[PDB]
Write a protein that binds this ligand. Structure first.
Ligand SMILES: CCCCCCCCCCCCCC(=O)SCCNC(=O)CCNC(=O)[C@H](O)C(C)(C)COP(=O)(O)OP(=O)(O)OC[C@H]1O[C@@H](n2cnc3c(N)ncnc32)[C@H](O)[C@@H]1OP(=O)(O)O
Length: 411
């Protein structure tokens, strides 16, 4: 490594929380120079008909992969990036001056997170992409340094991001598990096989989604549910919290003290034993009503959010998953988003979600072992994946924790 060694992240070479550096003042502000013939632009994902959007969609479709290609649609990208509070300058493009060919992208979105006894606005950096031909032209560190600069100028000094590769020391590692829905489609596409043991017909039967015990009262969310949903999440995070009740109701607001190395030191917290954290949520996204409205909605072939209503019009449960269309043949993959099971078991809620994914033409359903999802995927028909997702936080200390301690899902 000739870049990551110079950033405030935990290195491959503890048991406490808080900022790595409180450097409100001493960070670079001059926009970074690009190689001759390249220029930055703010990517206009606000107008779905724009040229910026076509170029971004094309760049990502052709080049965002470590075959098969994911195919983030334009509606998906607008949902995942034009979020409440988004800055125009956090959607960063690079183009060749002569041809106007988009050859790079990086994005950040603003989120609210709780980390142990602190709460803060932070950023999520995602969709880092360099045209296949310009790789090993050391362009990615520049996109990273530039998004960093644009985030710090908003007085945000931390970030969360994921990766397949191991870079520095991640605070947790998520593992994907996979539920097969459309056997025939996955078989013909070579994504799965027929166990030499059994026949195609039995394989299909083995992977059917059991629909012989159905939970009444689930329906898609609507805008007017947003306050009930906001409270539902607050109560879920209350139940699973890793701090006392008093700390939960009096979280250290880092936005208010991040301007001062004196005051910011308030955010440091030692941990007696890492096992004290066992199976509680330590870090998660926090949603206000505006956030709920945007994220927990329903957009065909992008995001599906169902709630359970009781006979008093009170929302008691929620499942949600997003959808990414892939091409090798068109394959639609659902991903588990956020799920709250209160009046049924988590397996039962997931069963209902899996049926809804099948009804939305999804061919498989992917779930990380985050939060409590291991209650679902242990001793089930889920198959463990090989894809392992490393979670990182920039400029904060988080002990290495189990994925069940993590309530953050990236797109
Ligand atoms: C306060 C705010 C702070 C905000 C900043 C928070 C940090 C954000 C971090 C970004 C979070 C990303 C979130 C997502 O989007 S996750 C998905 C990552 N993107 C892809 O998989 C798309 C397909 N791949 C590509 O487009 C390129 O290969 C990419 C762009 C990935 C690398 O480009 P390239 O292959 O042409 O190489 P280079 O010569 O230009 O540069 C080499 C340097 O780049 C480091 N590298 C390579 N890949 C990644 C990677 N996926 N994360 C972090 N670092 C990476 C590498 O260690 C090396 O550094 P070092 O070993 O010398 O030190």
């Amino acid at each position: 490594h000739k870049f990551w060694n110079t950033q405030p992240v935990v290195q491959n070479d503890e048991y406490s929380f808080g900022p790595i550096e409180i450097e409100p003042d001493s960070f670079r502000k001059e926009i970074y120079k690009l190689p001759d013939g390249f220029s930055w632009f703010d990517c206009n994902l606000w107008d779905i008909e724009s040229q910026d959007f076509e170029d971004t969609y094309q760049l990502l479709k052709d080049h965002y992969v470590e075959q098969f290609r994911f195919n983030y649609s334009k509606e998906f990208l607008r949902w995942a990036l034009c979020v409440p509070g988004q800055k125009k300058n956090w959607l960063v493009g690079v183009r060749v001056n002569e041809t106007k060919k988009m050859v790079g992208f990086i994005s950040a979105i603003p989120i609210k997170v709780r980390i142990h006894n602190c709460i803060m606005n932070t950023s999520v950096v995602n969709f880092l992409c360099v045209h296949k031909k310009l790789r090993s032209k050391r362009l990615a560190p520049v996109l990273i340094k530039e998004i960093t600069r644009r985030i710090r100028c908003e007085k945000i000094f931390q970030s969360i991001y994921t990766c397949g590769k191991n870079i520095t020391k991640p605070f947790t590692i998520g593992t994907y598990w996979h539920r097969i829905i459309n056997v025939k489609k996955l078989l013909e596409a070579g994504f799965i096989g027929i166990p030499r043991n059994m026949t195609m017909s039995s394989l299909i039967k083995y992977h059917r989604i059991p629909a012989d015990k159905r939970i009444e009262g689930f329906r898609p969310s609507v805008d007017s549910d947003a306050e009930q949903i906001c409270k539902l999440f607050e109560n879920y995070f209350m139940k699973y919290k890793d701090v006392s009740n008093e700390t939960m109701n009096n979280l250290i607001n880092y936005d208010e003290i991040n301007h001062s190395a004196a005051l910011g030191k308030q955010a440091y917290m030692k941990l007696d034993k890492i096992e004290d954290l066992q199976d509680k949520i330590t870090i998660h996204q926090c949603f206000n009503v505006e956030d709920v409205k945007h994220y927990f909605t329903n957009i065909d072939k992008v995001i599906v959010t169902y709630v359970r209503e009781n006979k008093n019009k009170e929302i008691t449960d929620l499942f949600s998953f997003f959808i990414i269309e892939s091409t090798v043949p068109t394959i639609n993959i659902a991903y588990s988003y956020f799920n709250i099971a209160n009046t049924c078991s988590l397996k039962e809620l997931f069963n209902e979600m899996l049926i809804t994914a099948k009804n939305n033409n999804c061919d498989a359903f992917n779930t990380l072992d985050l939060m409590q999802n291991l209650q679902v995927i242990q001793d089930s028909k889920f198959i463990i994946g090989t894809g392992r997702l490393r979670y990182y936080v920039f400029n904060w200390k988080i002990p290495q924790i189990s994925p069940s301690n993590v309530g953050i899902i990236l797109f």
